[PDB]
Design a binder for this molecule. Structure first.
Ligand SMILES: Cc1ccccc1-n1c(=O)c2c(C)c(C(=O)C3=C(O)CCCC3=O)ccc2n(C)c1=O
Ligand SMILES: Cc1ccccc1-n1c(=O)c2c(C)c(C(=O)C3=C(O)CCCC3=O)ccc2n(C)c1=O
Ligand SMILES: Cc1ccccc1-n1c(=O)c2c(C)c(C(=O)C3=C(O)CCCC3=O)ccc2n(C)c1=O
Ligand SMILES: Cc1ccccc1-n1c(=O)c2c(C)c(C(=O)C3=C(O)CCCC3=O)ccc2n(C)c1=O
Ligand SMILES: [Co+2]
Ligand SMILES: [Co+2]
Ligand SMILES: [Co+2]
Ligand SMILES: [Co+2]
Lengths: 341, 335, 341, 335
């Protein structure tokens, strides 16, 4: 409860996926250790689960997600927050100037309220959850025999979703979340990024601005502003790595060996087993001041759904996002190209 | 079981009430042995229960039930059938020509399908039922601590409810329940459903007690709801104990004629006659298909309730009409 | 401007017709001297006209009129009032408890507001009218060459539409028009009828209650409350009669010859040419007190659309509805059966 | 005439403006020579006219135009094509995959069809036009007495309007106007319509003046609207007389290069250079396809307007880009 929470937020509830071409999102869920676990009572949409992360696969045609997918490709096409009271939130959001998104509801099914968010993605406000009570219990039908609490590679919750937005728009969306939900900028990065945290301490949505770089090509390939990477939290990254590598997950190529030598200059006495991080390509960041250890282990997938990739992170006291790895990696590729030509 | 169930009916699920005067519907559920059990998550609507009977009290203003109540006063303003697949039924009713009634659904609540039925009241088609999965477990907040399976005076299910329609419209409403739900007829018309549990009898007709209902009710509508019980003498002493008002007893001449009209019925005539309970049925080939029944006052405008116990008779107490008539002649003559 | 007119009423605008079977309403319009004069830009609905009476033929399938026609047969299925400001009226009606009826509007076409009236018939509130401005100019397309102000047999305006309602409901609908439009009961008849006039002096809607009579059979055959007869006004009834008889109009059988002899006892010095009324079956009513002549000539068609019939009336100072003709006709059939057996 | 017109386009019908600050849009229509002529029958929306150009000022709150204006400031927030059959076009656009924008229509008003076009602004499809039968004769109340055909500074039609889109989205919007309306391309892309009158050029591109527009505008949108006139020197003295602010003149070196770049153009170079007017075209085979043009300041955020006169050139003044660039070098060197 970090500051005033007028919308009654209580963390991420679920993320929605859709693609214009079929069979492109199912196999990606598999390699990240997610399991299909239920199917909608009426619609052609499906629930994948791992730890406490719910992921919805929307394959409904002429639906709001398939239009979003028709324009952006394979994508994160929806995003739901947990709220205490979702009509108090939905009303307050429309009073403060949000535009509704009508999600068509079938008979005997739950009217899910959304507003227009990033890229035109619906932002749902959900006030039912918990076993037996959840919207998965009400509106979904679980697979016979299958388990409803799969643990997979050990991913626990969504840590954050970071958006890429067009030059200028970072301040626009930053006011969107500040005005309607009372988000606050907790961090700033100048390499350009604003780290918007929710008053619940769980919902983190970083926003990124570029020219001629990694962000500008994302907006070209995504055909608009959208979620660049989804970050899953894990209790142990190296074990999640093995369990993820066991099931065909592909990661970005490890940094040069130089990167792992410089670790004891960068973060003296971090305590991490460098052999184990070097054997997997895992990165590390944080700061080490006066006996207080704040660190962060993270590794990225390659791009998997169009220009969207994923992050697997374990936090050891650092509430940042790996920002130091950008300078750390350039000095690494630098010393390693120097050492060879 | 009887025959084919193209809409998958599985009994009555709930009936709904509305009134344009407050504090008039609650006292009537109470002396009928119903207990407030749950309150809607957001609207001013309430769940009263006894046995497996579900009574929704709708006090939501500017709504479907209030506009209905403003025209017809205290009424049964909605009726819900239970169904296997509510979506296939909804579209089937519509493609066969039914009209939809849209019921305004709040955020995070259940979108309830209904067509327009008798007198304009919504006919809901509900496919969520049973403990933990019904529409009350979802959209209603049970009074915390309160026993949520109250049994009360021992009323079990909604046996039937009947409709008073204007002259000529018996056929119109029989068709409506024939075309859409495959009801079969088994002046009155006893329309029974393919699931063996949903019975809707349709009455017409002048200057009599149906003419009086359609005046006092301001249109077609449900005239009485009948709740079944297993021991009507037992249900009677319970229902009396809490304040029920019955229509007053026949003249004792009605009881002199019992073993003449229903030879060897076997009922404790004294225990019945002490409570004004009616009898009806037939005794043929030693098979004594019989039934007990009593009614109440008009309690919601011209609407009242019947409390029946079925000892093998599939009827509704019809012969009680001629049977009472002769009890008033043989009492007038001896008066 | 007879009393306070909060809804800003200015007479009848149009009457709407629909039948479950085709070719049953077109030939009836003909014999009453109405002319097809336009067709809707998009919908399969048509304008018939004569003097200032507009009549709409709605043949649109799955429309609100075809559902009303599916239940009541050939019928008057809609009714529109002229108003000064139709959103002030439509708002006020919904504040005072009327239920809206949504009439589906096509693109580039006019949203017509209605509320639920008698039988579930929509009551439209129209604030555009007058040549060039009317809804017929906006939403309708006139037939090439054809005239747009046909005069026919000389029928001028709708004088009144009288409804039949179930026993008891006369007071209900009387409060409907009193509450929402400030109608007042101007006459009462005990034979049972309430004569509801509008605060503009033009809109007249009598309501009729029955048992075992002319009204009870109407509700049986109409399958509900509805308009029993539509009354057209004419400047000269006997000339309208000839012009109507010229085009195949069929009337109710004339009263006995007895009826026309008793006329000078009933209404001394009425001045009407009795030969001309007797030659046509036209009826007469009014009262004759102290040099003031208030009279009323009228004749009825047979039933033409199911149980619905029509009235052609000419008013000479009597603001009634022919009520005296009910007693006048029984005493007529009485003397005439006496004079023969 | 050019080629087949599957949506039956027949020119621009109106453009719509909205701003989230009051009293900022009206002064700009006035110095541009537009006159308030009509006011909506019920909403706070207004019709400004000059020539055959129709400008709708939408000040309706809690509406489609205000939400658009709150995001992008003073803007062109809607654009209407004129069409033979608006219903067949509407359904055709939808069956080809366009999305609908619903515009909330009051009682007794016209239900205006629109799809979602550039930047999210409605693209209306209007089939009522001309005097006595247009949407202004119906839904708008003309100021009584006011001359309803004002001619002003002699601007006639909307020549074109252009869109600034983000990098890569030129193709996206070309397809959108190719698939739905059969526009043909005839960094920029000049999309022209099958009716020979509707031209929408699409621009992208960094750190330049398009990057600056999509920042200052907060998305894709119309960057300038161009109104055609028959005598641009005449339109200039009129437009100046009433307060127009132009982008200031080229350096005189731009005029030393005219008869070098456009041999024997024949234009009164002194009358142009006194007004900062630009020239462009080609002279080949004695056919001198040429055009005159001037722009204004940014007047609605980063949006401005162009006033062109076409002497046989079908272009947009493109060569003026290189032509000015060389006028700033040859002026910097001599400075
Ligand atoms: C994955 C990748 C591919 C090709 C070029 C570069 C990368 N790449 C990243 O994208 C990357 C990101 C995206 C983060 C990161 O999560 C992040 C936040 O969530 C919010 C604030 C801004 C930010 O940097 C951290 C380290 C990263 N590092 C070290 C890396 O190399
Ligand atoms: C007539 C009357 C007046 C004042 C209160 C009560 C009564 N009244 C009834 O309403 C009454 C009813 C309503 C039934 C009955 O339930 C029944 C059905 O359920 C459907 C078929 C037709 C029918 O009548 C049976 C006997 C009745 N009897 C015997 C009686 O006296
Ligand atoms: C036409 C008809 C057929 C078979 C039985 C009778 C008739 N019949 C009528 O229906 C009839 C009517 C309907 C009126 C009449 O217009 C009317 C009003 O508009 C409102 C108040 C009640 C009323 O009577 C007047 C005279 C009538 N007369 C004289 C007649 O014979
Ligand atoms: C660059 C600039 C800065 C500050 C104000 C004005 C300008 N500016 C323009 O905006 C400008 C435009 C906008 C056009 C033009 O209308 C045109 C089209 O209509 C579509 C094809 C691409 C294109 O450019 C032509 C010449 C122009 N010129 C010469 C100029 O200077
Ligand atoms: Co991250
Ligand atoms: Co009964
Ligand atoms: Co009449
Ligand atoms: Co231009």
């Amino acid at each position: 409860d970090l500051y005033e929470n007028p919308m009654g937020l209580m963390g991420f509830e679920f993320i929605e996926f859709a693609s214009p071409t079929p069979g492109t999102l199912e196999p990606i869920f598999e390699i990240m250790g997610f399991t299909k676990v239920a199917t909608h009572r009426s619609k052609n949409v499906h629930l994948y689960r791992q730890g406490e992360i719910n992921l919805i696969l929307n394959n409904e045609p002429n639906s709001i997600a398939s239009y979003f997918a028709a324009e952006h490709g394979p994508s994160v096409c929806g995003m739901a927050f947990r709220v205490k009271d979702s009509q108090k939130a939905y009303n307050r959001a429309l009073e403060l100037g949000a535009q509704p998104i009508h999600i068509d509801t079938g008979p005997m099914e739950l009217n899910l309220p959304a507003i227009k968010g990033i890229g035109g993605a619906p932002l749902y406000l959900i006030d039912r959850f918990g076993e037996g009570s959840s919207i998965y219990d009400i509106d979904f039908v679980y697979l016979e025999g299958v388990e409803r609490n799969p643990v997979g590679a050990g991913l626990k919750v969504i840590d954050h979703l970071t958006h890429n937005v067009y030059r200028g728009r970072m301040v626009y969306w930053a006011n969107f979340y500040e005005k309607l939900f009372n988000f606050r900028e907790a961090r700033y990065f100048d390499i350009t990024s604003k780290a918007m945290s929710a008053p619940d301490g769980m919902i983190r949505i970083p926003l990124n601005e570029e020219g001629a770089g990694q962000i500008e090509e994302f907006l070209m390939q995504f055909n608009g502003e959208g979620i660049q990477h989804v970050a899953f939290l894990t209790d142990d990254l190296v074990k999640t790595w093995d369990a993820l590598k066991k099931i065909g997950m592909r990661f970005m190529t490890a940094p040069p060996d130089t990167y792992y030598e410089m670790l004891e200059g960068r973060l003296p006495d971090h305590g991490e087993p460098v052999d184990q991080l070097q054997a997997r390509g895992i990165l590390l960041d944080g700061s080490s001041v006066e006996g207080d250890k704040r660190l962060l282990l993270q590794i990225f997938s390659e791009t998997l759904m169009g220009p969207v990739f994923f992050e697997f992170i374990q936090r050891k006291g650092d509430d940042g996002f790996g920002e130091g790895n950008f300078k750390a990696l350039f000095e690494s590729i630098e010393r390693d190209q120097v050492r060879r030509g």
